[PDB]
Amino acid sequence: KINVKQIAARLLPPLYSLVFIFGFVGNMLVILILINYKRLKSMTDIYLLNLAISDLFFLLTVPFWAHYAAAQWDFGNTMCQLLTGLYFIGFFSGIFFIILLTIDRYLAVVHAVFALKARTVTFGVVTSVITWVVAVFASLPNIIFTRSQKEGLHYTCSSHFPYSQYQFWKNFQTLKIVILGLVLPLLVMVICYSGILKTLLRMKKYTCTVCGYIYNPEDGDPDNGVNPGTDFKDIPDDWVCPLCGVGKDQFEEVEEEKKRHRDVRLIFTIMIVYFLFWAPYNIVLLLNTFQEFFGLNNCSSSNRLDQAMQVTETLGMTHCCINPIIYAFVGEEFRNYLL
Ligand SMILES: Cc1nnc(C(C)C)n1[C@@H]1C[C@H]2CC[C@@H](C1)N2CC[C@H](NC(=O)C1CCCC1)c1cccs1
Numbered sequence: 001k002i003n004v005k006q007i008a009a010r011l012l013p014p015l016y017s018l019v020f021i022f023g024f025v026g027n028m029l030v031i032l033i034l035i036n037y038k039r040l041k042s043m044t045d046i047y048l049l050n051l052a053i054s055d056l057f058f059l060l061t062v063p064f065w066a067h068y069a070a071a072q073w074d075f076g077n078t079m080c081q082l083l084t085g086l087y088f089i090g091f092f093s094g095i096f097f098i099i100l101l102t103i104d105r106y107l108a109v110v111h112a113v114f115a116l117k118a119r120t121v122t123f124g125v126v127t128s129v130i131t132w133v134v135a136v137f138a139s140l141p142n143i144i145f146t147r148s149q150k151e152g153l154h155y156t157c158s159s160h161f162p163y164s165q166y167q168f169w170k171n172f173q174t175l176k177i178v179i180l181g182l183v184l185p186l187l188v189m190v191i192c193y194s195g196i197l198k199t200l201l202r203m204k205k206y207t208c209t210v211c212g213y214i215y216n217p218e219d220g221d222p223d224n225g226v227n228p229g230t231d232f233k234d235i236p237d238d239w240v241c242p243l244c245g246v247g248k249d250q251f252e253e254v255e256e257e258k259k260r261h262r263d264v265r266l267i268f269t270i271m272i273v274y275f276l277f278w279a280p281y282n283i284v285l286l287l288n289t290f291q292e293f294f295g296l297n298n299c300s301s302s303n304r305l306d307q308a309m310q311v312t313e314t315l316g317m318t319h320c321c322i323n324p325i326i327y328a329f330v331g332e333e334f335r336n337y338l339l
């Protein structure tokens with residue numbers, strides 16, 4: 001193997017220090033705004049706080065990985081298992097809360113009348129604790145294999161799998177991270193945003209550019225054969241404006257009025273940004289462990305893919321300081337609050 005450790009000792013400590021500062025300040029501001037300004041009045045507000053905590057737990061580990069890159073593992077065994085633990089917990093709960101935010105929006109938008117009954121602060125609180133328990137238990141096998149050890153003269157913090165079962169463990173721990181961190185959020189994204197997009201469209205108002213008439217799907221146009229609850233897009237093209245009598249071509253889409261519909265932009269941005277930072281590691285991890293059989297094992301491609309894993313995971317670690325920026329730009333409340 002090629003020694004990149006001499007290079008990593010120079011590069012990673014300043015990089016990890018910026019990410020820690022920027023990310024700690026950013027996530028802390030989100031937390032004080034949600035508890036003090038916003039005061040946690042919705043189910044959404046509970047999951048946002050918990051997501052902000054998941055980013056923080058993960059962030060606290062970053063100064064330790066920085067020092068370990070710089071020098072060696074000077075924190076000991078418990079610390080090695082704790083920080084590896086917090087890293088995995090912070091990772092799993094983070095994506096679990098991105099999934100819970102998506103499901104919350106699917107309920108508010110798709111099952112609106114039910115959501116009034118189901119979406120409460122206390123149900124959001126109850127589901128958060130369950131999520132944390134699931135995350136800790138998802139991280140637990142990984143914490144077991146992790147330990148501090150003196151290899152000759154230097155102290156290391158790594159996970160070591162039993163030699164007689166090494167391929168099995170690499171195989172299994174890869175599929176836990178890929179199923180939970182890529183596959184599971186992707187099915188949640190496709191299934192949920194299918195329903196959300198279909199509800200958003202079937203409920204879109206359209207205004208006539210000529211007379212100003214507003215077509216509302218809820219009302220329809222029953223005097224002209226258009227039954228209430230009809231997507232304007234589903235109306236036959238032989239239909240004309242009830243006021244000025246012009247065709248569908250002259251109709252323009254009305255900008256979203258419903259706040260619950262407007263909040264979709266934020267929660268979808270969070271998920272898409274998660275995939276930009278973490279889908280690269282997930283694919284390289286799957287390519288490394290498994291695809292060696294289904295691709296290449298060369299001393300070149302083995303060293304290339306292992307370096308690719310080092311890069312793609314540093315990129316993912318960066319994601320912990322990204323959500324505050326999203327809230328500052330896309331987040332409507334946060335925008336007016338700062339204004
Ligand atoms: C050490 C060290 N220096 N920097 C880092 C990253 C922040 C870039 N690291 C560690 C942090 C943790 C602890 C080891 C590894 C690199 N990292 C955990 C990576 C772990 N992926 C796996 O365990 C794979 C290896 C092959 C089978 C599973 C992840 C856990 C959650 C996301 S990634």
Ligand SMILES: [Zn+2]
Pocket residue numbers: 208209210211212213241242243244245246
């Ligand atoms: Zn008209």
